[PDB]
């Protein structure tokens, strides 16, 4: 009876060890999870924006642990300028064709149709091959209004550019009314941006929207 009763108490332990190992390999991946670094990164940037900028004017701050101040035109330049090497890591563009963002209103004083909420889509991104800090875009802007009378519509096409430098995207006025839309990401997130409209001539904040990516 002891034969076969001894071998059964081996395979039983073999399992009971692979638990104790495959528990700790997953429970370790918690601290290494990619989303943690992402989400906490966002918080880091929001406190630095609240402080004054440590750089000078058009310069950009690359420093991770040892600040190095470099001009704006060298981010994703194509070669190493920041002595960290931290300005070349970011050249992957975040917004791919077919991506569709929908904002909700925050407050609106630039009143064309004073919409409830408006939509934004990407026809096509494109990269000028040779010099690529800036990568131009085609974007629709859909707005589905409603009033007393009419169920009017709109979709004006425009063309902006996304800048790897300060992470802003721009939309050059779609109509002659001269309303530029100034996107601003935090830099670590890319599911939402707080971008808001501006009179292209005067550089004045008029109306904000909080966009989200749709999934």
């Amino acid at each position: 009876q002891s034969h076969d009763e001894i071998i059964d108490k081996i395979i039983e332990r073999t399992n009971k060890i692979t638990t104790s190992i495959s528990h700790v390999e997953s429970l370790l991946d918690d601290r290494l999870d990619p989303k943690r670094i992402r989400k906490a990164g966002s918080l880091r940037h929001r406190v630095e924006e609240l402080e004054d900028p440590s750089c000078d004017e058009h310069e950009h701050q690359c420093g991770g642990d040892d600040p190095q101040c470099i001009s704006k035109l060298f981010v994703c330049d194509g070669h190493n300028d920041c002595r960290n090497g931290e300005d070349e890591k970011d050249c992957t563009l975040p917004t791919k064709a077919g991506d569709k963002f929908i904002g909700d209103v925050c407050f609106d004083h630039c009143t064309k149709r004073r919409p409830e909420h408006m939509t934004l889509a990407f026809e096509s991104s494109s990269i000028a091959a040779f010099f690529t800090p800036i990568a131009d875009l085609h974007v629709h802007i859909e707005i589905e209004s409603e009033t007393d009378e009419d169920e009017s519509e709109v979709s004006m096409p425009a063309d902006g550019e996304y800048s790897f430098a300060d992470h802003r995207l721009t939309i050059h006025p779609p109509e002659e009314d001269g309303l530029g839309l100034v996107g601003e990401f935090d830099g670590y997130n890319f599911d939402r941006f707080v971008g808001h409209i501006v009179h292209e001539l005067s550089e004045e904040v008029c109306a904000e929207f909080i966009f989200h990516r749709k999934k």
């Binding site: 190992i21 700790v24 918080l43």
Partner: protein, 217 residues
């Protein structure tokens, strides 16, 4: 012979149950998981500096998309926002004015009495919420702070006032015919429902008599 090959397993496993159990220490000799509670109330300390488009006499909403809504429309029983933040128990929760709660933290006096920093507590003796006007929680309190003479002694004001769900700030006042008439303003704008930044004030000017950053036990 199968007994040999069996004994070869037992050993070869037990060298791994020793090797994992060795890593178990090196994993647990790194940092704790930093409980949700500190990051909860860190994000707040930022949110009190980034400026609000919302002006005075109104309170921004709690949710994803900040709006700016007038202060008499919270906990109303009608949704007045975009998302209807005003109906959710992340706001209606009364945990803060349940009777018997008490705040504390030693006070510095700038304006009166110059007593030298000594403990000061606020306490809530009785709370009522009227069924027909749920916007405010009417309540009564007793402020108490340690005069420093010889023996440990305390003067005890007595108070009444309302708790405003908008500002999140309860505010009290001296009753009438009470010695040394003071009032107290507690703002719970930090993350959790505990801690505060209070201030004892003179009831007329809202001039800041004594400032004490108070906790709860």
């Amino acid at each position: 012979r199968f007994q040999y090959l069996v004994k070869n397993q037992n050993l070869h496993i037990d060298y791994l149950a020793k090797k994992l159990h060795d890593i178990e220490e090196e994993y647990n000799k790194l940092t704790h998981d930093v409980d949700k509670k500190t990051i909860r109330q860190l994000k707040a300390r930022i949110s009190n500096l980034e400026e609000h488009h919302c002006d005075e006499h109104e309170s921004e909403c709690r949710g994803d998309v900040p709006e700016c809504i007038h202060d008499l429309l919270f906990c109303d029983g009608e949704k007045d926002c975009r998302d209807g933040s005003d109906e959710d128990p992340e706001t209606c929760s009364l945990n803060i004015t349940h009777v018997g709660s008490s705040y504390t933290g030693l006070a510095t006096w700038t304006s009166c009495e110059d007593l030298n920093p000594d403990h000061a507590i606020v306490t809530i003796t009785a709370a009522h919420r009227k069924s027909f006007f749920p916007n405010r929680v009417w309540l009564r309190a007793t402020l108490s702070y340690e005069l420093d003479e010889h023996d440990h002694t305390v003067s005890t004001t007595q108070l009444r006032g309302f708790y405003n769900f908008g500002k999140r700030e309860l505010l009290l006042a001296p009753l009438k015919g009470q010695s040394e008439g003071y009032g107290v303003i507690c703002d719970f704008n930090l993350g959790d429902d505990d801690h505060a930044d209070c201030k004892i004030v003179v009831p007329s000017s809202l001039f800041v008599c004594a400032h004490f950053n108070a906790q709860r036990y």
